[PDB]
């Protein structure tokens, strides 16, 4: 079938609220 | 019933839970009080103190 | 050793009967394996004792 190349699909790796920060996470 | 203690059946219940998760509705037997607001207090919100 | 088939289930920790009691007995704190096979093809003759 056809193939595609996306930069989408992020998800929240945690259950807390963060704002105006750059957070480095691994998952 | 004739076996030694090490070979008798034992009933095991394992209670598994994660404690650092943000929401929780499972438990808490302590009574709540009035939320004071705008004043230095010692607070306990869902186990977080 | 050579045993009767009805006795094979008796060669185990904690068991009692006419074997594993006033006969070859395994410890309750036993580490090891009990390996057994049917020997009738060699012992089918009427040897008696
Ligand atoms: C590569 O990605 C871009 C942007 O998603 C898309 O427009 C383009 O068609 C893609 N190329 C291939 C071969 O998938």
Name B21's Cβ contacts closer than 8 Å, sequence gap at least 6: A15
C11 class by beta-carbon count within 10 Å (0-12 exposed, 13-18 middle, 19+ buried)? middle
Each residue of B5-40: b (16+ CB within 10 Å) or e? eeeeeeeeeeeeeeeeeeeeeeeeeeeeeeeeeeee
A19: Cβ below 6 Å to ligand 1?
no
**Residue from A2, A4, A7 whose mutation best tests the ligand 1 pocket (most atoms within 8 A of CB):** A4
Experimental structure resolution, Å: 3.0
Nearest CA-CA partner of B47 in C17, B35, B33, B30: B30
Q: Which atom of ligand 1 is nearest to the CA of A3?
A: 14
Q: Are C25 and C15 in contact (CB under 8 A)?
A: no
Q: Are C11 and C19 in contact (CB under 8 A)?
A: yes
């Amino acid at each position: 079938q056809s193939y595609t190349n996306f930069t989408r699909g992020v998800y929240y790796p945690d259950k807390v609220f963060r704002s105006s920060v750059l957070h480095l996470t691994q998952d | 019933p004739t076996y030694g203690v090490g070979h008798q059946p034992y009933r095991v219940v394992v209670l598994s839970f994660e404690l650092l998760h943000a929401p929780a509705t499972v438990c808490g037997p302590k009574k709540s009080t009035n939320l004071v607001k705008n004043k230095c207090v010692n607070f306990n919100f869902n186990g977080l103190t | 050793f050579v045993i009767k088939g009805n006795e094979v289930s008796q060669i185990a920790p904690g068991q009692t009967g006419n074997i594993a009691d006033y006969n070859y007995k395994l410890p309750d704190d036993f580490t090891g394996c009990v390996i057994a096979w049917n020997s009738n093809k060699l012992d089918s003759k009427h040897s008696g004792n």
